[PDB]
Structures are given as structure tokens and as C-alpha cells.
Design a protein around this motif. Sequence first.
Motif, PDB file in Angstrom:
ATOM      1  N   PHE A 183       0.648  -1.113  -0.080  1.00 12.39           N
ATOM      2  CA  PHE A 183       0.026  -0.142   0.027  1.00 12.39           C
ATOM      3  C   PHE A 183       0.868   1.302  -0.054  1.00 12.39           C
ATOM      4  O   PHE A 183       0.267   2.356   0.202  1.00 12.39           O
ATOM      5  N   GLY A 184       2.208   1.043  -0.361  1.00 11.23           N
ATOM      6  CA  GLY A 184       2.900   2.502  -0.108  1.00 11.23           C
ATOM      7  C   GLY A 184       3.294   2.538   1.038  1.00 11.23           C
ATOM      8  O   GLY A 184       3.248   3.713   1.773  1.00 11.23           O
ATOM      9  N   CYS A 185       3.629   1.620   2.262  1.00 17.46           N
ATOM     10  CA  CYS A 185       4.078   1.915   3.522  1.00 17.46           C
ATOM     11  C   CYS A 185       5.404   2.424   3.156  1.00 17.46           C
ATOM     12  O   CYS A 185       6.244   2.032   2.369  1.00 17.46           O
ATOM     13  N   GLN A 186       5.899   3.017   4.286  1.00 19.70           N
ATOM     14  CA  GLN A 186       7.297   3.667   4.513  1.00 19.70           C
ATOM     15  C   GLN A 186       7.850   3.043   5.862  1.00 19.70           C
ATOM     16  O   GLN A 186       6.914   3.140   6.833  1.00 19.70           O
ATOM     17  N   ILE A 187       9.099   2.963   6.217  1.00 20.18           N
ATOM     18  CA  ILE A 187       9.623   2.693   7.434  1.00 20.18           C
ATOM     19  C   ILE A 187      10.439   3.809   7.822  1.00 20.18           C
ATOM     20  O   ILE A 187      11.202   4.286   6.841  1.00 20.18           O
TER      21      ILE A 187
END
Lengths: 49, 49
Positions: B13-17
Motif C-alpha cells: 500500500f506504499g508503506c514506508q519505514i
Amino acid sequence: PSLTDMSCEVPACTHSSDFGGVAIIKYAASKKGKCAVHSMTNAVTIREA
Amino acid sequence: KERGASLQHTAPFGCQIATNPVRAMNCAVGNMPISIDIPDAAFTRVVDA
């Protein structure tokens, strides 16, 4: 001043406790002067004489 | 040398860390409600319109 063009309506009314209705009167009086505005029915209470 | 694709790259889902502390930003999924109350300092009468 005799009024013609008695075209009244309300933007939005709300049967609140206070004056939750405020209606818009477009009108054509003849001239300048005071006018007796009155609610004939006890259901409606205009707050202005 | 072969850990390879970090979870920055594995993110659905287009996460980013983001480290310090690690956190999952910017996968805006779902629908967020907000209730906001505003007084009559903003609203003006339609006869002012």
C-alpha cells in the motif's frame, strides 16, 4: 409606505427554542418610513417590532 | 551482505519505514473520520451574502 412585491422566503429555519428561523423578505415599498411587521399566528414569534 | 530488500522496499500500500524509533508511515489506507466543532464566529448571515 405601502409595500408591494411581497416575496418572502427563508434561507434556513430550525424549530429551536430560540429564533432558529430567520426568513428573507424581498419587497417593494412605495417610499421611506417605518413598517409594522407582525406575526398574526401564535405559532410564530417575530422578535422584532 | 544478503539481507537484501529492506522492509522499506517490501511495503504494501506504499508503506514506508522510519527508524529511531521504527515506524510505519504513509500507508494511508481506510477512511479517517474527524469531528470538528466550530462556533458562529465563522458563519455569517445569508443577507450578508
